[PDB]
């Protein structure tokens, strides 16, 4: 199991960790906020806080004004995507900017919808669906991602078991193949094979 | 905060059940296999199996042979597909099955290369390439999805926003707006607003 998801699992395991989160989805709240509203207290919110600062999913700013304290306020990271994945074959998360991602015509024509000077109910229920549209979309996609996924994993399993069987009785051929190949297999994977010999 | 989240949740919060369910992914396995493995003991397996039954996430089924006990064994539910998504607007989870079937092109043409009779280092060559092929389409398919995912986030933030800002000085437009919608939202998103606004 990856560092990443076991750590992250473990900070939202905790209730109250993920009520907080749920809070900031709505606006940042200063601690005070949160304290009254989910009834806790400024001792452990202030700590739950701290933890999802220091899984990287919360940031604080300091907003003063004249003849007052500083008074922090809280927010999840701008720009942050963060997905939990499991299916019979992945278990995984992936943690992720949005500035990072291309802008794309969807993304355009969402925009659009949302802008429009449509009528609250015929907005909704253009964006309602559009939403369909978009979701059977990238379940298209995520399908498609795990056939190549079934594909690629094949290979690699092959390669492994090839390139140890073979470096047992001859390591000299193997070399010769590995030296032939580790600039065309992607990096990672590459070492990741040098390394176990 | 949804109901299936908040659950969902709280089940993968244990280290235990998040263990198993790593295993799980490998292929199936009997409690004994899971409680060695884990060194946890057979009753808390059982335990936090059971938990992730109800969950939804797993399921048994019961192998005999003659002479022998029941004894059965433990996988990811067969077409399970679960998300877990957070961004500064959002937080929540979808969970649907994929239709269960398809074996691709590519799977076939790897099938392939692996069995054909050509020599061990025209193989590997092969082989690379086609791997290296494979990785770039992956990149532009996980491109592609994250491109149609922050317009996906973009309408359910609104959805979720407009559907609160209103649920204010006047829930009677709304209610009909969510009875003209709902069958339209994929139904986990639709009972993540109705037991949030309403």
Not at 115 to 144: D, G, T
């Amino acid at each position: 199991m990856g560092e990443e998801l076991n750590r992250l699992l473990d900070v939202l395991g905790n209730e109250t960790r993920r009520r907080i989160l749920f809070l900031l989805t709505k606006r940042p709240y200063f601690v005070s906020e949160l304290s009254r509203e989910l009834g806790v207290g400024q001792k452990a919110v202030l700590e739950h806080l701290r933890i999802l600062e220091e899984a990287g999913l919360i940031e604080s700013r300091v907003e003063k004004i004249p003849r007052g304290r500083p008074r922090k306020y809280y927010m999840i990271k701008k720009g942050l995507r963060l997905e939990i994945l499991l299916t019979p074959t992945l278990f995984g998360s992936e943690m992720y900017e949005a500035k990072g991602v291309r802008k794309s015509p969807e993304y355009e024509q969402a925009k659009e919808l949302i802008k429009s000077q449509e009528p609250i109910n015929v907005k909704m229920r253009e964006l309602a669906e559009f939403l369909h549209e978009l979701n059977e979309r990238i379940r298209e996609i995520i399908e498609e991602k795990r056939e190549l996924e079934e594909a690629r994993i094949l290979i690699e399993t092959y390669i492994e078991n090839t390139m140890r069987r073979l470096a047992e009785e001859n390591r000299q051929i193997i070399e010769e193949i590995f030296r032939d190949i580790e600039k065309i297999l992607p990096p990672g994977y590459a070492r990741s094979l040098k390394e176990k010999f």
